[PDB]
């Protein structure tokens, strides 16, 4: 499968999540995603084909994971934007007020600005600390997807938000949205990964 930020993948033929970013670990290919999407060794599929398994994750506390893929997958330095693509150029962290977009299988590519950093989400499973908050909307299924600037600087992966009864926070004003992402930097150093760029 072609691995691009934002596309859907399933875990153990049940849940759906979105791909965050293509990365490598030495000769191993992988992608970073949300920790709440799977447990170590869970199987990931893309378009009904097995592509790899969860190699590690932390959730709750943090919300991160990486899936190691088979040799046959094609990693690309790109994030889905409808039928087009945003090229990943690096991982400079943007500051509060920067504009940012996110991509995932449920709401597509949405943009907004970062409103706060170091936020705690109180999930049923336990607290998740250190999240960055943006006001781009998102829905159930967007988790693990990419957060990136239009300039191609990868910011992190989708963790959660104040989803309403329709499954997203897209029907409420930007002013009232809380969409949280796990920072990419600590995920790359924690697992020794390098981002694929173009």
């Amino acid at each position: 499968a072609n691995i691009v930020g934002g596309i859907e993948y399933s875990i153990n033929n049940a849940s759906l999540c979105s791909v965050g970013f293509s990365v490598t670990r030495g000769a191993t290919k992988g992608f970073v995603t949300a920790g709440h999407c799977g447990t170590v060794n869970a199987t990931a599929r893309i378009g009904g084909a097995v592509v790899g398994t969860f190699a590690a994750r932390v959730f709750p506390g943090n919300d991160r994971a990486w899936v190691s893929l088979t040799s046959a997958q094609t990693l690309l330095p790109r994030v889905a934007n409808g039928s087009s693509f945003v090229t990943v150029r690096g991982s400079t962290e943007a500051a509060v007020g920067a504009a940012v977009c996110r991509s995932g299988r449920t709401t597509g590519y949405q943009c907004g600005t970062i409103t706060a950093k170091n936020v705690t989400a109180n999930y049923a499973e336990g607290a998740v600390r250190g999240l960055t908050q943006g006001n781009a909307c998102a829905g159930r299924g967007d988790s693990g997807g990419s957060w990136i600037t239009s300039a191609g600087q990868a910011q992190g992966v989708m963790s959660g938000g104040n989803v309403q009864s329709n499954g997203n926070n897209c029907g409420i004003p930007a002013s009232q949205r809380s969409s949280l992402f796990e920072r990419l930097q600590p995920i790359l150093s924690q697992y020794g990964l390098s981002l694929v760029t173009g």
């Binding site: 999930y123 998102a138 299924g141 989708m158 959660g160 938000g161």
Partner: peptide, 4 residues
């Protein structure tokens, strides 16, 4: 907030 909820995960996703």
């Amino acid at each position: 907030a909820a995960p996703v």
